[PDB]
Design an enzyme around this catalytic site. Structure first.
Site, PDB file in Angstrom:
ATOM      1  CG  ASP D  45     108.159 -39.587  38.721  1.00 19.60           C
ATOM      2  OD1 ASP D  45     108.929 -38.644  38.440  1.00 19.60           O
ATOM      3  OD2 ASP D  45     107.413 -40.130  37.877  1.00 19.60           O
ATOM      4  CD  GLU D 120      98.076 -39.313  44.225  1.00 22.42           C
ATOM      5  OE1 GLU D 120      98.904 -39.374  45.160  1.00 22.42           O
ATOM      6  OE2 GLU D 120      98.376 -39.544  43.035  1.00 22.42           O
ATOM      7  CB  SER D 155     101.846 -32.965  37.343  1.00 25.27           C
ATOM      8  OG  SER D 155     101.835 -32.760  38.746  1.00 25.27           O
ATOM      9  CB  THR D 158     100.591 -39.412  34.679  1.00 26.52           C
ATOM     10  OG1 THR D 158     101.333 -38.503  35.502  1.00 26.52           O
ATOM     11  CG2 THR D 158     100.303 -38.750  33.340  1.00 26.52           C
ATOM     12  CB  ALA D 159     100.223 -40.751  40.036  1.00 23.05           C
ATOM     13  CE1 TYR D 160      95.030 -45.938  43.543  1.00 20.51           C
ATOM     14  CE2 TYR D 160      94.097 -44.144  44.817  1.00 20.51           C
ATOM     15  CZ  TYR D 160      94.147 -45.484  44.500  1.00 20.51           C
ATOM     16  OH  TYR D 160      93.315 -46.374  45.142  1.00 20.51           O
TER      17      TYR D 160
HETATM   18  N1  LIG Z   1      98.463 -46.435  41.620  1.00 20.69           N
HETATM   19  N2  LIG Z   1      99.424 -45.899  41.305  1.00 20.69           N
HETATM   20  N3  LIG Z   1     100.356 -45.289  40.738  1.00 20.69           N
HETATM   21  C1  LIG Z   1     101.602 -45.000  41.478  1.00 20.69           C
HETATM   22  C2  LIG Z   1     102.595 -44.253  40.611  1.00 20.69           C
HETATM   23  C3  LIG Z   1     103.946 -44.058  41.283  1.00 20.69           C
HETATM   24  C4  LIG Z   1     104.971 -43.377  40.390  1.00 20.69           C
HETATM   25  N4  LIG Z   1     104.680 -41.955  40.167  1.00 20.69           N
HETATM   26  C5  LIG Z   1     104.821 -40.929  41.074  1.00 20.69           C
HETATM   27 BR1  LIG Z   1     105.636 -41.193  42.723  1.00 20.69          BR
HETATM   28  N5  LIG Z   1     104.350 -39.782  40.678  1.00 20.69           N
HETATM   29  C6  LIG Z   1     103.857 -40.057  39.408  1.00 20.69           C
HETATM   30  C7  LIG Z   1     103.226 -39.243  38.447  1.00 20.69           C
HETATM   31  N6  LIG Z   1     102.966 -37.944  38.622  1.00 20.69           N
HETATM   32  N7  LIG Z   1     102.861 -39.823  37.282  1.00 20.69           N
HETATM   33  C8  LIG Z   1     103.115 -41.124  37.101  1.00 20.69           C
HETATM   34  N8  LIG Z   1     103.702 -41.986  37.935  1.00 20.69           N
HETATM   35  C9  LIG Z   1     104.051 -41.383  39.077  1.00 20.69           C
END
Ligand SMILES: [N-]=[N+]=NCCCCn1c(Br)nc2c(N)ncnc21
Ligand SMILES: [N-]=[N+]=NCCCCn1c(Br)nc2c(N)ncnc21
Ligand SMILES: [N-]=[N+]=NCCCCn1c(Br)nc2c(N)ncnc21
Ligand SMILES: [N-]=[N+]=NCCCCn1c(Br)nc2c(N)ncnc21
Lengths: 261, 261, 261, 261
Positions: D45, D120, D155, D158-160
């Site tokens: 990603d 984000e 989208s 799901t990350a930070y």
């Molecule tokens: N705190 N913290 N989390 C960092 C996640 C890094 C991996 N990663 C990326 Br780069 N983009 C996405 C996404 N959209 N959804 C899920 N994981 C992702």
């Protein structure tokens, strides 16, 4: 010494029980489920909870042991493959004991009923909205409004207390933790939100505001109490004594259950 | 006894300081900011934190007192209107002391640097991603991945520890609490999530995985440490001693600061 | 137009109702609680909820209005001092309407029962442990284990959804949010933990694993359903229509209720 | 069509790239990393994020594709074993596209700088304490006090956003979510605490209170901005377009990454 063994009731736990009785029959060990000094639970943490409350009137005369025939438990934390070695060193005696704090729950009516909990005691509302005034050491602390409250033992912090966001305390800390269940917080109603850890001799009191009927649970048991006037929480003077036979750290036990194994 | 007074630096805190010195001048009290037995902080909890770390080499010879010229603080917890009564009973002596646990933070390099914290010590990453292996009593507990970790003192639980979801411990419990900052949890990376409460003599170690530079904070101070090899957390053998002059319960102090006043 | 007014039942809400009927009597307004086009609720958000479910069979023919005689509500959000001005502009007509999404809840037995919710619908266990398989768009998503689940409307996000850690959605977003209640998470049982926001036409299904009796609530109503085979959640095609008479932003309404007023 | 392929830089991602170029050489496909209509990212990603920001000036002319040579990603969500089949159906064309919302971030100085984020944008304090006034649609909402704020794309939830307790939104919902980082809440300072979901055209503004220097991050990039006067968050009019070649539901993608696979 006298001894007894409870079993989850399924096939393998019953067969492991009869195997330990036969192994115990090769020693100076009499079976007795009325006045035992050693209680062995086979199955899971729930089976261990039943064994604890079954002998909660004589806690200072019993060393508890839990065997898990399924996944790892925090009380039933010894594999079945170590059953034959448990029997021998139990038969020798001269093992060391470890003691955990317990929770004392008092309920007053317009009459008094006390209870002991190994994990936690919870208070929810009998149908209607749950509203109580929280009194810590005779000082009003807050007016709680939500789904209920949970006062957890140190070893009980890994159970229901963990699902409610509470912290995990090492069971060598004589304390009790209070957690909130879906508390309502707006500009007029305020709860602390954070879990609270209380030392010994600290008394936490729950007092009704409207309805005096609460669904009070203590470990697995849950009974609807009517016309309740006060619920008192404090660290119990009584303790549970385990039979220590190897080295299984609490944090290692936490790791194997939640991180990886 | 010898004494000294620190001030926040604003007008009212300086004027309240000179008023207490003048009130102290009417007794057998010598001013001395080098070897005092009584330290008074005027301002807020931050001003008290500066006074603590200023005399953290002689903690067993000093009784601390905090006066809040602004909102209520958990260390500066005596109103300015009680300044004149503080001076008199301080001048008599024969008051009782209360002691709180402290946090010991050790940092090892390829050299060693120890620190004492009254609230908490935090570990964040110097720019890059924060990854550490968490070792509890020489046993690997977890591989943390997120924004950082916070090890809090009992009295420090109401500060940064509270914002991170940690529980509030009564300061009579000799322990330390660890909390997580924005931990990443997916099918392959796993953290405990729950806060952890450690008793005395329990040593929590943070060990690097990639980058060996961490932004380590201790109370208000924060310094970037490079080529770090280990961070050790444990309850300190040293304690801070307050001068008890009235009755202000910790839970009452928690109530007035977060619920209502 | 036809109209009717519900009241909380206390003194001031009844007197404010009769005052608006008298004010309505000075216009071309007939009172009718069987086929009204304008429904006014006086009291609180709970009184408004009763008025909604009372006329939930004819939602496309009614503009709702809520008056709070107590604290500010998210549906009863117009002060009593504006009652006399509400009557006049309501009597003119030619106001604009605003529409909010609703939650559709379907329950299947070994028979079918559908419901509409303005705030949320919850699913808890009838005594025993709560275990369900969560199916999103016919794909198995997770096996939930805990106290229950809550599917919230956009406007319902400020109610029970907020106490469960859920996010606050602006009611112009046609969606539904699912939140977890005290979910158990260990090395073998896994829940997503995060709240989930589903757009229109997305169907979330709850399917039993052991016990087929669940305590299903819909807004204030809560009924024990037995021999349940499936619970289906989706954004309803029906909407509720408010009568817009001034400008009261949802975020301003959130601010006044939780931050300050 | 023109095309280009970025690679994580490790051995297998480079070799998979040259294999697809050779496979593309058997079709009417010209390689061009200046004006491509198809962009393929190989790695993770993060590698996909670099490819997005590399061509964020021509988003309406490009269909993006991500291949994960490691664990499953939410953007790089196609296995390497499907590389040879990706080349053929990409060479045919006549595939369907899917579009995700983006985050627009505006920064004003005493000058203006706009940015686009796929995951984000975060705002933290340059050393000192982080204090901002949160303004939603020109109405003051709250005075935030803590570690910072995070405005996430659908989208990007799901990350930070997920680590901060935020909810997971389906990317078909044109919205943006705001989450809090270690917010301080006492009797005098109040934050909403709950995450906030904002629809299109809703503008969220952050305005300084003391220090005008903030550490502003946008996806992987993070730059210290000085003398900042306003930060504006809103759903971007621009969208990212993926090349849809099979069926991989977002909730299935969430399941495989956090529950089990
Ligand atoms: N705190 N913290 N989390 C960092 C996640 C890094 C991996 N990663 C990326 Br780069 N983009 C996405 C996404 N959209 N959804 C899920 N994981 C992702
Ligand atoms: N909610 N919810 N959680 C129920 C946990 C049931 C299993 N279980 C028992 Br029974 N006792 C313990 C314990 N002390 N720690 C961890 N799991 C335990
Ligand atoms: N994040 N964040 N929070 C900062 C709190 C700063 C004020 N403050 C100090 Br300085 N020390 C304490 C303490 N022990 N309890 C409560 N507030 C405190
Ligand atoms: N738990 N719990 N919370 C009960 C809230 C009851 C009041 N109330 C109603 Br009834 N509806 C709403 C709403 N939509 N938003 C905010 N409060 C509301």
């Amino acid at each position: 010494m006298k001894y007894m063994i409870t079993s989850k009731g399924d096939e393998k736990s019953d067969l492991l029980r009869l195997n330990m009785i036969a192994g115990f029959g090769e020693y100076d060990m009499e079976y007795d489920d009325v006045e035992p000094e050693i209680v062995i639970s086979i199955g899971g943490d729930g089976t261990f909870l039943s064994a604890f409350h079954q002998y909660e009137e004589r806690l200072d005369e019993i060393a508890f042991i839990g065997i898990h025939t399924g996944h790892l438990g925090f009380y039933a934390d010894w594999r079945p493959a170590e059953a034959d070695k448990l029997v021998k060193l139990l038969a020798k005696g001269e093992y060391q004991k470890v003691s955990y704090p317990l929770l004392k729950t008092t309920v007053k009516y317009g009459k008094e009923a006390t209870y002991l909990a190994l994990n936690e005691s919870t208070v929810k509302s009998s149908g209607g909205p749950f509203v109580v005034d929280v009194v810590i050491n005779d000082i009003h602390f807050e007016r709680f409004r939500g789904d209920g409250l949970c006062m957890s033992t140190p070893s009980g912090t890994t159970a229901y207390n963990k699902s409610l966001g509470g912290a995990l305390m090492h069971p060598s800390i004589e304390a009790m933790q209070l957690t909130e269940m879906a508390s309502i917080n707006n500009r007029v109603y305020r709860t602390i939100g954070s879990p609270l850890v209380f030392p010994k001799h600290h008394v936490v009191s729950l007092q009704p505001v409207n309805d005096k009927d609460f669904q009070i649970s203590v470990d697995h048991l849950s009974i609807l109490h009517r016309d309740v006037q006060e619920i008192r929480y404090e660290v119990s003077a009584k303790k549970i004594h385990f039979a220590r036979f190897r080295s299984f750290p609490f944090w290692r036990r936490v790791h194997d259950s939640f991180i990886e194994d």
